[PDB]
Amino acid sequence: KLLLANWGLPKAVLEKYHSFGVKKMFEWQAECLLLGQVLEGKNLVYSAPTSAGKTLVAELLILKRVLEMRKKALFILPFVSVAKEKKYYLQSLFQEVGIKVDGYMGSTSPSRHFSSLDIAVCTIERANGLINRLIEENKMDLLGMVVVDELHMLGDSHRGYLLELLLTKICYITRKSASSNAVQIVGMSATLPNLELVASWLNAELYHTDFRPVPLLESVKVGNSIYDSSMKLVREFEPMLQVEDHVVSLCYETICDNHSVLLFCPSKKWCEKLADIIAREFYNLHHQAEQKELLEVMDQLRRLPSGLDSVLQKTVPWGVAFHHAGLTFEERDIIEGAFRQGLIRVLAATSTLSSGVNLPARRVIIRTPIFGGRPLDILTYKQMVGRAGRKGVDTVGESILICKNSEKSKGIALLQGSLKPVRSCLVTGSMIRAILEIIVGGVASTSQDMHTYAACTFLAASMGAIEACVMWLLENEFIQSTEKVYHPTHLGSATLSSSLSPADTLDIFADLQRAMKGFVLENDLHILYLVTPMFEDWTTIDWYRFFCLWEKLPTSMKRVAELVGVEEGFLARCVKGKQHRQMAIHKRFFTSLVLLDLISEVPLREINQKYGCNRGQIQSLQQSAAVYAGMITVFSNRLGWHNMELLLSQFQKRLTFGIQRELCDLVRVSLLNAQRARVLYASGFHTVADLARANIVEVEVILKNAVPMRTIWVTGRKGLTEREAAALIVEEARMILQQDL
Amino acid sequence: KLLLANWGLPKAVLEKYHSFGVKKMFEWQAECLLLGQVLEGKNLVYSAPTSAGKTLVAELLILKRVLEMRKKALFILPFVSVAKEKKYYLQSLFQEVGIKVDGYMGSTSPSRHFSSLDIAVCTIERANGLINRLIEENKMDLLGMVVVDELHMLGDSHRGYLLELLLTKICYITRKSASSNAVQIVGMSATLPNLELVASWLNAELYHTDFRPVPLLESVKVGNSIYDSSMKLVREFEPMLQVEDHVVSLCYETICDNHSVLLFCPSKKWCEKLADIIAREFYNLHHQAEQKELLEVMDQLRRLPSGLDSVLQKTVPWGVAFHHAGLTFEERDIIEGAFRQGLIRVLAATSTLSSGVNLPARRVIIRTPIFGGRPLDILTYKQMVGRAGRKGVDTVGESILICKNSEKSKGIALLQGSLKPVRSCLVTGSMIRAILEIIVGGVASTSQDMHTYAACTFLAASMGAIEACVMWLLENEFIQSTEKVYHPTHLGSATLSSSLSPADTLDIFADLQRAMKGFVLENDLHILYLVTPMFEDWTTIDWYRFFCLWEKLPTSMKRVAELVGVEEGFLARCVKGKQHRQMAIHKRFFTSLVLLDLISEVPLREINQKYGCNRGQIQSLQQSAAVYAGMITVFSNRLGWHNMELLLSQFQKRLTFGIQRELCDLVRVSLLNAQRARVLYASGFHTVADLARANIVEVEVILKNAVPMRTIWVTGRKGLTEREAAALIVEEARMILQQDL
Ligand SMILES: Nc1ncnc2c1ncn2[C@@H]1O[C@H](COP(=O)(O)OP(=O)(O)NP(=O)(O)O)[C@@H](O)[C@H]1O
Ligand SMILES: Nc1ncnc2c1ncn2[C@@H]1O[C@H](COP(=O)(O)OP(=O)(O)NP(=O)(O)O)[C@@H](O)[C@H]1O
C-alpha cells in the first residue's frame, strides 16, 4: 500500500511523479491518507517536518476530490514566490488531465474566468478576495476544497489573520448550510504545539508526525569545539585552512566533501562581506595564488535589466555567492536556481530565504543568534535548519549556530526550545474586517445570526467586542441599521469588493474625493499618487536627495505636490535641521516620484544611483503598488466613479511590468517583462496582433541585439535559449489571440 | 444609344435601375457622357436643372471608373441628410457588385477601414479630413475619382470653401505628379453663369444644358389674377371656397385635381399657423361640418421619443402638415416620407427644405418675397421652384410667388433674375487653412513650390497675401522655418490631423491647457465643456431660466463654472438689467449644461420645456457637438495627451445617440438610437454580445412595450414592422461581432 501506483491515480500524473523523483511513499503519508473517514468529505489538519513530504498528501487529496466530484479547489500559499512555484509545479504535473490551473498572485490576474479554472493556486491576500467574490454572488457550489499551506501563520502575522478570517468564513458557511461535506479544508503545518485546538476549530481529524527522510543533528560552536543540542560535545573542531569563529572553514570542509552550504547572515551588508571573504579564500586555499555551466549563470546575469552586481562579479565563478532581499527578483531566481543544480556551493543569505522556496543543502550555518538587534525567532530557526539534508543523497543533515560569550545562553534556548503556539490576533482591525466581510456579503444580517459567526471564530473556539465592531461600522456609514438588521451601503459594498481594510478605506474615500475638484492630466504623478500603498519600511528616505528632487522637478510636478497638501516651504528643508498624517504624505509623495520613473522605463541601474534605493527595495514596491492600483480601480467601480476607473484601468498593468502605454498589448505574452518588449517594439511590431503573425526567424535577430546558450531568462522557466524563447513568443501569441475571441 | 442596357453596365445594377423607375436616358445625359475624351481620365463639369437627371451621369461615370480601374472613388455631398440618402441609395444599388459603400457624415464613422471601402459617400467637412489623411501618409494611389455635388456652393458659404480647398489640393497634387489621369473630378451644378471659368479651373470639359423633364411655368399673383414670368397674364384667378391672398384656395384647386402642394413659409411660427389654417378649412370645405395609410403615419409619430406634436395632432390626418427646422430629425423624415408616398398632400415648410432631399410636387407656393427681414436669395428660389413637376406623372410644373403692394418689384426681379456667379472667399481664414493643409502634409515645403499651389487655387485661376499666411502661422508656432523650408510642429501636426480651423485651434490649445492644472471627474460637465462647439445661433438663451439653472445645480456643477472662468457674481444677473470672450463662455457654459442632460437620457419633451429650446434646435447641437468631440480627441492624440483622449474617447458616441456609458456597446447596431437600447437594456441584455445570441421571439415582447403595422422607425429605412425590426437587430448583431474579429 506504500506505493503510488497502487493508489488510484491518472497514468500521466503518475509518470510525471516518477519524472520528479517521487515514487516511494513514506509510512506517515499513507497513515495520514488512511485516517479513517478523512477522504470522503471531512477536513484534515496534519503536521510534519519541512522536508517530510507535506505537499504529497495534499496533492493526493486534491486529486481525489477533483476527479471524484468536479469542483473548483483552492490552493492557499503564504508568499508570492512560493505561490508562483507551486502553480508552475501543478501545471507541469496537470497539463494532460484537463485540470486547468492558474493563480491569483497580487498584480497578476488570470485571463480565463474562474469558472473555466479548476485549481486556483492563490496567495492569502487574493484568496480572501476570491472567496469574498464567490460568497457575494452566491457561487459557492463551484468551490469544493480549500487547501492551506503553513496553517501556523494565522498567529501574529501581517497576513495570517486574513487566512483566519477566510477559514472561519468557510466554516461558518458550511455550518449554516447544514441547518460527506461540501468543502474540505486540508492544511499543513510545522510542529505546532496546540494543533489539537486548531484541529478541533475546524473539527478536523489530526495526525501529527515527526518523520524525517534524513536525521537532523543540530549543533553549537564553542571556540574550536562543537557541542550537540543537549549540551554534549560530538566532534572536536579543527581548522583546515584560514587566512575563533573560523566561519570560512565550515564551508571548506563541506566543499572538499563535494556538497553545498547555506550561510545565513543577519544583514545584507554582512552577506556581501561574507560572500566576498569566502571567494577570496578560494584563491589561495585552492589555487595557491562545473566551470562551463557556472559561466552560463554569469552570462544569464550579464544582460539582466540591472546587469551584473559588482560584488557578484568577484564571487560567482567559484561556487560562492550571496542572495538577500536587496538583490533583484530576477537575480534571486537565477542564484537560487544555480543552487538547485549545484553550480553555486555557498549561499550567504539573510532571513528572507527561510520562508522562500524549497532549497536543500547538506549543511546550514547561522552566523549570529541576534538578527537586527533582537533574538532570532524560533519559528525562523526551525525553517532555517529545516533545509539541512537533501533527500536521497545526503545521509545526514547538520545545522551549526554560532554563539559567542554571554550570547551562548540565548543560542542554547533556541536548540532546546519549541515553536510558540498559534494566537488569534482578534476593538481590533482584524475583527472589523471580519464583521464587514459577512454583512456586506449578505450571509448574516441579524445580530443573533451574526453572533453565531462570532462563535465560529478562532478566538471563541480556543475556549463583547463583536458588537463594538458594528457600532464602529455604523458610525462611519459603512453599514446602515434598520428594523436590528444591518444593510450594506455604497461605501460598504466597495470596501468588501475591493478587499481593503476598513481603516484604510475611510482615508482613501476622503483622499480620492479630495480629487473630486482638483486634478491634473499632463503627468501620471497625481494618478500614480493615488495608487502608492504607503511608505511602510520600503526604503530609507534621504532628504538632501529630496532637495535635489524638489527643485529639478518640472513646473507641473510641483503643481501636483500643492494639490495633495505637500508644502514647498517644508519639503526636505526642516528635516535637515532636525504631524503624523503630514509626514505620511511627503514620504508618500516620494513613493509616487519613484513609481513615475518606474513606469517611464528608467533602468533600474540609473534609478538605484538616482533614488538611492536598490533594485530589491524597488521591486518590493512596484509589485506592491500594482496590487494597490488593482484595488483602487475596483474601489471606484463599486462606488460608481467611471471617470477615474478609466484613468486607473491601465495603471495596474503599467506598474507590474514598468512599461508605458505603448507596450500594454505587447506585455500580455508572459515572455516580455520590461526589456523584451521595448526592443521588440522598436522592430515595428507595435501590437500583440502582428507579433503573432511576425516571422519566426525575424524576431531572432532583434532579441539577439540590445545586450546591456540558455541565456535568456523567463519568469518561472529558469533560463531559456535565445532560439527557444523567441520561438515561444510567437507560439504563445497565437494562443493568446485565439483564446480571447 | 439612348438606352441604359446598351451602355456597359452590370446586370444587377441595370435591374435595380429598372426597379427605381429609371430606364430612359435623356439626350443631354448621353451627350454629356459622349463629350469626346471625358470618360478615360479627364475631369468633367456639367450643369443641368435640379430635376434633369444630374445624378445618373455621375453614377455611370463612377461605375465605369470603378469597374475599369479598381480605385477608391469619393462622393461629396453638401448636407448630412442628403449624404445619408445618397449612401443608402448607392448601397441599395450596389449590394451585389461587391463595391462596398459607406460614408463619413460627421459623428458617424465606418467600422471597416477605408482600404476595405470602395465608395465613400462623404460630406464636405469630412471629405476634406479624409483627403488630408490620404495625402498625409502617402496613400494617394487608392483614390481614383472625386465626385462633387453642387459645385456652386464653393462661393459665399460656410463649407463650400472647404470644397474649394479640397479640389485645389487634388488639382495641385495631380499637376505636381506629372512633372489618362489618376483622379477624375466629376461635378454637378445648377445654371452657373461662369461655369466656363470653373471648368477651366480644373481644365475640365464643359457641357451646359437646360433640358427639363416637364416644363416649368413660374408665375406671380396680383389680387385675383396670375401673371407669368414676363409680366404677362396667363390665367384669371378665381376663388373656389374660403372661410386677397387666398392662400388656402391654391392648395384646394390642386387638391381636387388629386395632386400635392409645397407651401414654403418664412418662419416656423408661420408654418404652424398656416398648416393649422388649411387643416381647418378641410373640415367645412370637404365635410360641411388613403385614410388607412395616413393613420399609420400618426402611429409612427405616436411612440417617437418626443411623442406627437400638438400642432401636428390637429393637422396630420387630412393631407395637411408642416415641416421645418424646429421639428425633430426623426419627425422630419416621417413627414417627408409621407409626402413621397402622397399620404400628406400639403407641406408648410421653411427655407430649410430647399436644399433637402429630392421632394417633388405638382405645385410650389412661396408666401412672401421677404425671408427673415431680407429679400429671398435667388439661389434658394431656384432650388425651391425646382421641385415643381413630378417626372412621368405631372404634365407641367407651376411655381407661384406671392407679392403684395410695393414688394412686387422685388418679386419680379427674382423671376427674371439669374443666380449670381461663384466667388472665391479667399489675411483670410480660408487661406490660412489652405496653406496649413499642405505644409503640414509635407507635399510642398519650399516657398516657390508653395507659390505654385497659390497659382492652382480658384482665385488665381479666375484671372501677396499668400506669404502673409505663412507669417501668421510662423508667429503662432504652427510652422517652424529653417534653411526657406517650412516644417510642421507638434501643434501644426495636430491642427491638420484633427481638421480644425487654425483660428480655433489656438484657443482650444490654450483652453485645453487651462485644464492642465484643474480638472474634475465626478460629473461629465467639465469634460463636456471641452467639446461644446460654440454658442453660434443654435438657440435663443433665456437668462431668467439660467437663474433657475444656476441655483438648482449641485455643489459640483457650480465648481466646474469657477474652474472655467464663469463668475457667480455675474451669471444671469447683470443681463436682466441690461467682454466678447467672456460672453462666449457663459453661453458656452449653458451649451454644456444642455448636453449634460442630453447624455443623461433626459427625454426631449422634458428637455424642451426645461431648457426652452425645442428638439429641432437641440439635435442641431448634439450632432454638431458629437463631431467636435471627434476632433478634440484627435487633437489630443497628435499632441501626445493620452490621459484626456481616454476620457474623451467615448464622448463622441455618447453625444451622437444621447446614451450613457452602459449602452455604448449596445448602440453599435444601427437599429437602436436612444430608446430601443434602454428598453432592451432593462431586459437583461447588457452587451451586444449576448444580444446576438438573444432569443428571436424574446426581444419581440420587450420592444412591444414601453410606448411613450410598420410603426417602428429605422434611420434611413423609413418605418419598419415590429417583427421585422426586432428580427434585424439580432441579424445585424451577428454580422457585427463576426466581422469585428
Ligand atoms: N514520499 C516521498 N518520497 C520522496 N520524496 C517525496 C515524498 N513526498 C514528497 N516528496 C518530495 O520531497 C519533498 C518534501 O516535502 P516538502 O519539503 O514538505 O514540500 P515543500 O518544500 O513544502 N514544497 P513547496 O510547497 O513548493 O514549498 C516534496 O516537496 C516533494 O518534492
Ligand atoms: N434619364 C432619366 N430618366 C428618368 N429619370 C431619371 C433619369 N435620370 C435620372 N433620373 C431620376 O430623376 C431624377 C432627376 O435627377 P436629379 O433630380 O438631379 O437627382 P437628385 O435630386 O439630385 N438626387 P440626390 O443626389 O439624392 O439629391 C434622379 O434623381 C433620378 O432619380
mmCIF file of all heavy atoms in Angstrom, chain B residues 412-442, unseen atoms left out:
data_model
loop_
_atom_site.group_PDB
_atom_site.id
_atom_site.type_symbol
_atom_site.label_atom_id
_atom_site.label_comp_id
_atom_site.label_asym_id
_atom_site.label_seq_id
_atom_site.Cartn_x
_atom_site.Cartn_y
_atom_site.Cartn_z
ATOM 1 N N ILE B 412 -40.645 90.406 -58.808
ATOM 2 C CA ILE B 412 -40.455 90.275 -60.250
ATOM 3 C C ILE B 412 -38.986 90.065 -60.586
ATOM 4 O O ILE B 412 -38.654 89.293 -61.497
ATOM 5 C CB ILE B 412 -41.034 91.508 -60.975
ATOM 6 C CG1 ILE B 412 -42.556 91.551 -60.822
ATOM 7 C CG2 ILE B 412 -40.646 91.506 -62.447
ATOM 8 C CD1 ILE B 412 -43.289 90.562 -61.704
ATOM 9 N N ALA B 413 -38.084 90.731 -59.859
ATOM 10 C CA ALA B 413 -36.657 90.576 -60.123
ATOM 11 C C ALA B 413 -36.199 89.137 -59.927
ATOM 12 O O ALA B 413 -35.287 88.677 -60.622
ATOM 13 C CB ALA B 413 -35.853 91.516 -59.224
ATOM 14 N N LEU B 414 -36.811 88.414 -58.986
ATOM 15 C CA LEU B 414 -36.449 87.015 -58.774
ATOM 16 C C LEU B 414 -36.796 86.160 -59.988
ATOM 17 O O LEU B 414 -36.020 85.280 -60.376
ATOM 18 C CB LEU B 414 -37.144 86.479 -57.524
ATOM 19 C CG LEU B 414 -36.290 86.372 -56.261
ATOM 20 C CD1 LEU B 414 -35.760 87.736 -55.847
ATOM 21 C CD2 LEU B 414 -37.091 85.744 -55.136
ATOM 22 N N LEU B 415 -37.963 86.401 -60.591
ATOM 23 C CA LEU B 415 -38.386 85.597 -61.735
ATOM 24 C C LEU B 415 -37.476 85.804 -62.937
ATOM 25 O O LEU B 415 -37.080 84.837 -63.598
ATOM 26 C CB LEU B 415 -39.836 85.923 -62.096
ATOM 27 C CG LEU B 415 -40.914 85.215 -61.273
ATOM 28 C CD1 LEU B 415 -40.573 83.746 -61.151
ATOM 29 C CD2 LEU B 415 -41.069 85.839 -59.898
ATOM 30 N N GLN B 416 -37.131 87.054 -63.238
ATOM 31 C CA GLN B 416 -36.297 87.367 -64.389
ATOM 32 C C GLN B 416 -34.813 87.416 -64.054
ATOM 33 O O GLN B 416 -33.994 87.613 -64.958
ATOM 34 C CB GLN B 416 -36.731 88.701 -65.006
ATOM 35 C CG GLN B 416 -37.997 88.609 -65.842
ATOM 36 C CD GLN B 416 -38.791 89.901 -65.844
ATOM 37 O OE1 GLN B 416 -38.605 90.757 -64.981
ATOM 38 N NE2 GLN B 416 -39.681 90.048 -66.819
ATOM 39 N N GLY B 417 -34.446 87.239 -62.785
ATOM 40 C CA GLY B 417 -33.050 87.248 -62.408
ATOM 41 C C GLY B 417 -32.374 85.912 -62.636
ATOM 42 O O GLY B 417 -33.000 84.901 -62.950
ATOM 43 N N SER B 418 -31.053 85.919 -62.468
ATOM 44 C CA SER B 418 -30.238 84.726 -62.621
ATOM 45 C C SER B 418 -29.331 84.576 -61.408
ATOM 46 O O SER B 418 -28.955 85.559 -60.768
ATOM 47 C CB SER B 418 -29.395 84.775 -63.903
ATOM 48 O OG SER B 418 -29.172 83.472 -64.414
ATOM 49 N N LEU B 419 -28.991 83.327 -61.099
ATOM 50 C CA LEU B 419 -28.174 83.040 -59.930
ATOM 51 C C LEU B 419 -26.779 83.632 -60.099
ATOM 52 O O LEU B 419 -26.172 83.545 -61.170
ATOM 53 C CB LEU B 419 -28.122 81.525 -59.700
ATOM 54 C CG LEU B 419 -27.089 80.841 -58.803
ATOM 55 C CD1 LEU B 419 -27.661 79.528 -58.307
ATOM 56 C CD2 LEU B 419 -25.817 80.560 -59.565
ATOM 57 N N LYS B 420 -26.276 84.242 -59.027
ATOM 58 C CA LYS B 420 -25.037 85.000 -59.097
ATOM 59 C C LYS B 420 -23.841 84.081 -59.347
ATOM 60 O O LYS B 420 -23.838 82.923 -58.922
ATOM 61 C CB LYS B 420 -24.824 85.787 -57.805
ATOM 62 N N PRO B 421 -22.809 84.578 -60.030
ATOM 63 C CA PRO B 421 -21.623 83.750 -60.280
ATOM 64 C C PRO B 421 -20.902 83.401 -58.986
ATOM 65 O O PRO B 421 -20.966 84.131 -57.995
ATOM 66 C CB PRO B 421 -20.753 84.632 -61.186
ATOM 67 C CG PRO B 421 -21.678 85.679 -61.724
ATOM 68 C CD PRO B 421 -22.699 85.904 -60.659
ATOM 69 N N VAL B 422 -20.210 82.260 -59.010
ATOM 70 C CA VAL B 422 -19.490 81.798 -57.828
ATOM 71 C C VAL B 422 -18.355 82.761 -57.491
ATOM 72 O O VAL B 422 -17.837 83.492 -58.343
ATOM 73 C CB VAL B 422 -18.960 80.370 -58.034
ATOM 74 C CG1 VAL B 422 -20.076 79.364 -57.846
ATOM 75 C CG2 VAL B 422 -18.338 80.231 -59.415
ATOM 76 N N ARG B 423 -17.966 82.752 -56.222
ATOM 77 C CA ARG B 423 -16.890 83.587 -55.713
ATOM 78 C C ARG B 423 -15.765 82.694 -55.195
ATOM 79 O O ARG B 423 -15.792 81.470 -55.347
ATOM 80 C CB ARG B 423 -17.411 84.532 -54.627
ATOM 81 N N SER B 424 -14.765 83.319 -54.580
ATOM 82 C CA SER B 424 -13.596 82.616 -54.066
ATOM 83 C C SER B 424 -13.528 82.579 -52.548
ATOM 84 O O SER B 424 -13.102 81.569 -51.985
ATOM 85 C CB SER B 424 -12.317 83.258 -54.610
ATOM 86 O OG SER B 424 -12.396 84.672 -54.556
ATOM 87 N N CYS B 425 -13.939 83.657 -51.876
ATOM 88 C CA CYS B 425 -13.874 83.757 -50.416
ATOM 89 C C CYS B 425 -12.455 83.508 -49.906
ATOM 90 O O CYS B 425 -12.249 82.880 -48.866
ATOM 91 C CB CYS B 425 -14.867 82.800 -49.751
ATOM 92 S SG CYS B 425 -16.522 83.487 -49.515
ATOM 93 N N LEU B 426 -11.472 84.009 -50.646
ATOM 94 C CA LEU B 426 -10.070 83.825 -50.289
ATOM 95 C C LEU B 426 -9.382 85.171 -50.084
ATOM 96 O O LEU B 426 -9.609 86.115 -50.839
ATOM 97 C CB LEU B 426 -9.342 83.018 -51.365
ATOM 98 C CG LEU B 426 -9.051 81.544 -51.067
ATOM 99 C CD1 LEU B 426 -10.286 80.837 -50.538
ATOM 100 C CD2 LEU B 426 -8.522 80.843 -52.307
ATOM 101 N N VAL B 427 -5.506 89.190 -44.457
ATOM 102 C CA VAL B 427 -5.489 87.735 -44.411
ATOM 103 C C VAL B 427 -6.909 87.205 -44.234
ATOM 104 O O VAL B 427 -7.799 87.926 -43.780
ATOM 105 C CB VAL B 427 -4.560 87.224 -43.288
ATOM 106 C CG1 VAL B 427 -5.295 87.183 -41.955
ATOM 107 C CG2 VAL B 427 -3.995 85.855 -43.641
ATOM 108 N N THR B 428 -7.120 85.944 -44.608
ATOM 109 C CA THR B 428 -8.419 85.300 -44.509
ATOM 110 C C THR B 428 -8.268 83.944 -43.837
ATOM 111 O O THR B 428 -7.220 83.300 -43.932
ATOM 112 C CB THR B 428 -9.073 85.117 -45.886
ATOM 113 O OG1 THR B 428 -8.172 84.421 -46.757
ATOM 114 C CG2 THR B 428 -9.426 86.465 -46.497
ATOM 115 N N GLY B 429 -9.330 83.516 -43.153
ATOM 116 C CA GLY B 429 -9.322 82.212 -42.516
ATOM 117 C C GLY B 429 -9.346 81.053 -43.489
ATOM 118 O O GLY B 429 -8.955 79.940 -43.121
ATOM 119 N N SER B 430 -9.799 81.287 -44.722
ATOM 120 C CA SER B 430 -9.810 80.223 -45.720
ATOM 121 C C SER B 430 -8.408 79.937 -46.240
ATOM 122 O O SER B 430 -8.039 78.772 -46.435
ATOM 123 C CB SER B 430 -10.743 80.599 -46.870
ATOM 124 O OG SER B 430 -10.620 81.971 -47.199
ATOM 125 N N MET B 431 -7.612 80.983 -46.473
ATOM 126 C CA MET B 431 -6.264 80.781 -46.993
ATOM 127 C C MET B 431 -5.318 80.248 -45.925
ATOM 128 O O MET B 431 -4.387 79.500 -46.244
ATOM 129 C CB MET B 431 -5.723 82.086 -47.578
ATOM 130 C CG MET B 431 -4.876 81.895 -48.826
ATOM 131 S SD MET B 431 -5.643 80.785 -50.022
ATOM 132 C CE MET B 431 -4.222 79.860 -50.593
ATOM 133 N N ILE B 432 -5.529 80.624 -44.663
ATOM 134 C CA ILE B 432 -4.671 80.135 -43.586
ATOM 135 C C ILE B 432 -4.777 78.620 -43.473
ATOM 136 O O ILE B 432 -3.769 77.913 -43.368
ATOM 137 C CB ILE B 432 -5.023 80.831 -42.259
ATOM 138 C CG1 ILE B 432 -4.541 82.281 -42.276
ATOM 139 C CG2 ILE B 432 -4.410 80.089 -41.085
ATOM 140 C CD1 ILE B 432 -5.037 83.101 -41.108
ATOM 141 N N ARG B 433 -6.005 78.097 -43.500
ATOM 142 C CA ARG B 433 -6.184 76.650 -43.500
ATOM 143 C C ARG B 433 -5.680 76.025 -44.795
ATOM 144 O O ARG B 433 -5.155 74.906 -44.777
ATOM 145 C CB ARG B 433 -7.653 76.297 -43.278
ATOM 146 C CG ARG B 433 -7.943 74.809 -43.338
ATOM 147 C CD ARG B 433 -9.434 74.531 -43.340
ATOM 148 N NE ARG B 433 -9.725 73.173 -42.898
ATOM 149 C CZ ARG B 433 -10.647 72.860 -41.998
ATOM 150 N NH1 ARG B 433 -11.389 73.788 -41.418
ATOM 151 N NH2 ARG B 433 -10.830 71.583 -41.674
ATOM 152 N N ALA B 434 -5.833 76.728 -45.919
ATOM 153 C CA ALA B 434 -5.359 76.201 -47.197
ATOM 154 C C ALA B 434 -3.856 75.971 -47.173
ATOM 155 O O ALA B 434 -3.368 74.914 -47.593
ATOM 156 C CB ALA B 434 -5.735 77.159 -48.326
ATOM 157 N N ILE B 435 -3.103 76.960 -46.691
ATOM 158 C CA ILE B 435 -1.653 76.832 -46.624
ATOM 159 C C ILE B 435 -1.257 75.745 -45.634
ATOM 160 O O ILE B 435 -0.381 74.918 -45.912
ATOM 161 C CB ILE B 435 -1.025 78.188 -46.259
ATOM 162 C CG1 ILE B 435 -1.299 79.206 -47.369
ATOM 163 C CG2 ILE B 435 0.465 78.036 -45.993
ATOM 164 C CD1 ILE B 435 -0.183 79.349 -48.363
ATOM 165 N N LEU B 436 -1.900 75.728 -44.463
ATOM 166 C CA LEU B 436 -1.555 74.754 -43.435
ATOM 167 C C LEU B 436 -1.895 73.331 -43.862
ATOM 168 O O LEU B 436 -1.270 72.377 -43.386
ATOM 169 C CB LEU B 436 -2.270 75.109 -42.131
ATOM 170 C CG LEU B 436 -1.956 74.268 -40.894
ATOM 171 C CD1 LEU B 436 -0.870 74.933 -40.068
ATOM 172 C CD2 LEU B 436 -3.207 74.055 -40.065
ATOM 173 N N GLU B 437 -2.868 73.163 -44.758
ATOM 174 C CA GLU B 437 -3.268 71.825 -45.175
ATOM 175 C C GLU B 437 -2.228 71.134 -46.043
ATOM 176 O O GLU B 437 -2.350 69.926 -46.281
ATOM 177 C CB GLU B 437 -4.602 71.887 -45.920
ATOM 178 C CG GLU B 437 -5.806 71.549 -45.057
ATOM 179 C CD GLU B 437 -7.051 71.268 -45.872
ATOM 180 O OE1 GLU B 437 -7.195 71.853 -46.966
ATOM 181 O OE2 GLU B 437 -7.886 70.459 -45.419
ATOM 182 N N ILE B 438 -1.216 71.854 -46.519
ATOM 183 C CA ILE B 438 -0.214 71.313 -47.428
ATOM 184 C C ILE B 438 1.142 71.163 -46.742
ATOM 185 O O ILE B 438 1.766 70.103 -46.810
ATOM 186 C CB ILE B 438 -0.099 72.180 -48.701
ATOM 187 C CG1 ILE B 438 -1.206 71.822 -49.692
ATOM 188 C CG2 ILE B 438 1.263 72.012 -49.346
ATOM 189 C CD1 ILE B 438 -0.935 70.559 -50.476
ATOM 190 N N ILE B 439 1.614 72.222 -46.080
ATOM 191 C CA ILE B 439 2.949 72.196 -45.485
ATOM 192 C C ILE B 439 3.026 71.140 -44.389
ATOM 193 O O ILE B 439 3.990 70.369 -44.312
ATOM 194 C CB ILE B 439 3.330 73.588 -44.953
ATOM 195 C CG1 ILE B 439 2.926 74.672 -45.956
ATOM 196 C CG2 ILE B 439 4.818 73.651 -44.664
ATOM 197 C CD1 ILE B 439 3.539 76.023 -45.673
ATOM 198 N N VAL B 440 2.012 71.095 -43.520
ATOM 199 C CA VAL B 440 1.949 70.035 -42.517
ATOM 200 C C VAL B 440 1.776 68.678 -43.178
ATOM 201 O O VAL B 440 2.217 67.654 -42.641
ATOM 202 C CB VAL B 440 0.829 70.324 -41.500
ATOM 203 C CG1 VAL B 440 1.055 69.527 -40.238
ATOM 204 C CG2 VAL B 440 0.806 71.802 -41.164
ATOM 205 N N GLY B 441 1.138 68.638 -44.347
ATOM 206 C CA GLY B 441 1.102 67.411 -45.119
ATOM 207 C C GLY B 441 2.417 67.059 -45.781
ATOM 208 O O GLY B 441 2.583 65.916 -46.220
ATOM 209 N N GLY B 442 3.347 68.009 -45.863
ATOM 210 C CA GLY B 442 4.661 67.760 -46.415
ATOM 211 C C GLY B 442 4.739 67.746 -47.924
ATOM 212 O O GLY B 442 5.818 67.481 -48.467
#
